[PDB]
Structure 1
Amino acid sequence: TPLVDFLMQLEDYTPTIPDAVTGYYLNRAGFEASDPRIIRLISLAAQKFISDIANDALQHCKMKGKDRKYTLTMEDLTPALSEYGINVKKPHYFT
């Protein structure tokens, strides 16, 4: 069982998102998470998604060439979000 094998590997990884934060957002979604390994798997999936978006943004920033400190500006996050299903469109210069 791939999911069971992944849970066995997880029996070591601790996610950045705490269990009370994830265990609350499952409560608004419709269930109280009894087993504290399901909370861990969902938190790890969310952490992977955020990390991938941020790393794609960092790669665009590194490609533009400035090489000392990388600022998470909207010019690097907005093309990095469109590869997934997040399409932001922020205005400028309100007349």
Structure 2
Amino acid sequence: TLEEILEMMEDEEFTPIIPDAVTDYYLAKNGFETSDIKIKRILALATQKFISDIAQDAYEYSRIRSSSSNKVVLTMDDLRSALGEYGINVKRPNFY
């Protein structure tokens, strides 16, 4: 539902990977102070989820690359494709 979701963030049973201090810094940067702890953990959580989504995009787009049916590296082609499929813009690096 929704009210369970702020029943749960308060206690230690669900404490986002993003530490409280770092999110406090980024709240403060973009201009928000409040003496609640829920909301900050919540924005932490949503960001965690969004990065998880690009993670799975990268995983699958790496899994297509060869042999469908010296370890794994998430390179610039994998990233070029997933970031592109979002709205993140074109990565056209170069040399010379």
| TM-score range normalised by the length of the shorter chain | 0.7 to 0.9
TM-score of the superposition, structure 1-length normalised?
Answer: 0.81
- Residue 66 of structure 1 and its aligned partner are, at CA, apart by 7.5
| Contact 1:7–1:37 (Cα < 8 Å) also in 2 | yes
Q: How many residues align?
A: 93
- Provide the residue aligned with 2:47 in structure 1: 46
| Contact 1:26–1:33 (Cα < 8 Å) also in 2 | no
TM-score of the superposition, structure 2-length normalised?
Answer: 0.80
- Provide the residue aligned with 2:87 in structure 1: 85
Q: Which runs of 5+ in 2 are unaligned?
A: none
RMSD across aligned C-alpha pairs, in angstroms? 2.2
Runs of 4+ in 1 over 3 A off after TM superposition: none
- Residue 72 of structure 1 and its aligned partner are, at CA, apart by 1.3
Q: What amino acid sits opposite 2:44 in the alignment?
A: S
Q: Which runs of 5+ in 1 are unaligned?
A: none
Q: Per the alignment, do residues 5 and 85 of structure 1 end up closer, same or farther by CA in structure 2, a change over 3 Å counting?
A: farther
| Partner Cα separation in structure 1 for residue 43 and residue 83 of structure 2 | 20
- Provide the residue aligned with 1:7 in structure 2: 6
Q: Per the alignment, do residues 8 and 78 of structure 1 end up closer, same or farther by CA in structure 2, a change over 3 Å counting?
A: farther
